[PDB]
Design a protein around this ligand. Structure first.
Ligand SMILES: [Ca+2]
Ligand SMILES: [Ca+2]
Lengths: 129, 123
């Protein structure tokens, strides 16, 4: 039992949203959707199968990713301390779209796998409360 | 001074190859190419440009590896509900930086894949 439009699975409510927002923005959007809401957190196998059935049965209408709550809560575009020769990586020239630091889900992988994606993307998502 | 097969830049020796190998293997291979060999580490834009003009003139246009791997693997990962990373469902285990002969930009490809590469050592 959950609000109208939310689905239940193990005492939690889930809502697939078909809005194209950046990670940072879909996250902020979920907090203001329910009491203590956030982007879905897949913390178990069963939970992941459920989010996949949900995402498939609801979002699958315009080819793209579906955000999930996992993110390097930091500002490091990479986190590997050194180069193979043992030097400090202190010079950079990353393409932004190329530092895939937020995670997503996708139809290509039957919405059961985490794909490293660019945080500035605009994709739908699943919130959880 | 560098072997006849290497290009010299600021007291270092760079040489690009064309046997697509995984990250680990391509880094393995480099140590066996000369005492102190390793995959290419770009300590600067200048060094990075030199390497780019170099891979270009040689094999003209393809993707080369670089000395960065396990890049985001040791980042602090946690869900937005503040939970720690425990369950996992990653599609790819680790990422490796690589560049392409057209520009001096750092890209990222899964480590266990294949591309060309540039080895280097000093003096
Ligand atoms: Ca959860
Ligand atoms: Ca170097």
């Amino acid at each position: 039992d959950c609000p109208s439009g939310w689905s239940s699975y193990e005492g939690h409510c889930y809502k697939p949203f078909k809005l194209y927002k950046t990670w940072d923005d879909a996250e902020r959007f979920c907090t203001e959707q329910a009491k203590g809401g956030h982007l879905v957190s897949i913390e178990s196998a069963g939970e992941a199968d459920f989010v996949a059935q949900l995402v498939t049965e609801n979002i699958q209408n315009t080819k793209s990713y579906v955000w999930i709550g996992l993110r390097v809560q930091g500002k490091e575009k990479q986190c590997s301390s050194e180069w193979s020769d043992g030097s400090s990586v202190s010079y950079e020239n990353w393409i932004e779209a190329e530092s895939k630091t937020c995670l997503g889900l996708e139809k290509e992988t039957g919405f059961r796998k985490w794909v490293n994606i660019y945080c500035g993307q605009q994709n739908p998502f699943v919130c959880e409360a | 001074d560098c072997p006849s097969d290497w290009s010299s830049y600021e007291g270092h020796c760079y040489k690009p190859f064309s046997e697509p190998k995984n990250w680990a293997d391509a880094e393995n291979f480099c140590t066996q190419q000369h005492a102190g060999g390793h995959l290419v580490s770009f300590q600067s834009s200048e060094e990075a440009d030199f390497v780019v003009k170099l891979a270009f003139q040689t094999f003209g246009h393809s993707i080369f590896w670089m000395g960065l791997s396990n890049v985001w693997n040791q980042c602090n990962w946690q869900w937005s509900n503040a939970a720690m990373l425990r369950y996992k469902a990653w599609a790819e285990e680790s990422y490796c930086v690589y560049f392409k002969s057209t520009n001096n930009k750092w890209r990222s490809r899964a480590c266990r894949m294949m591309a060309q590469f540039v080895c280097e050592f000093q003096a």
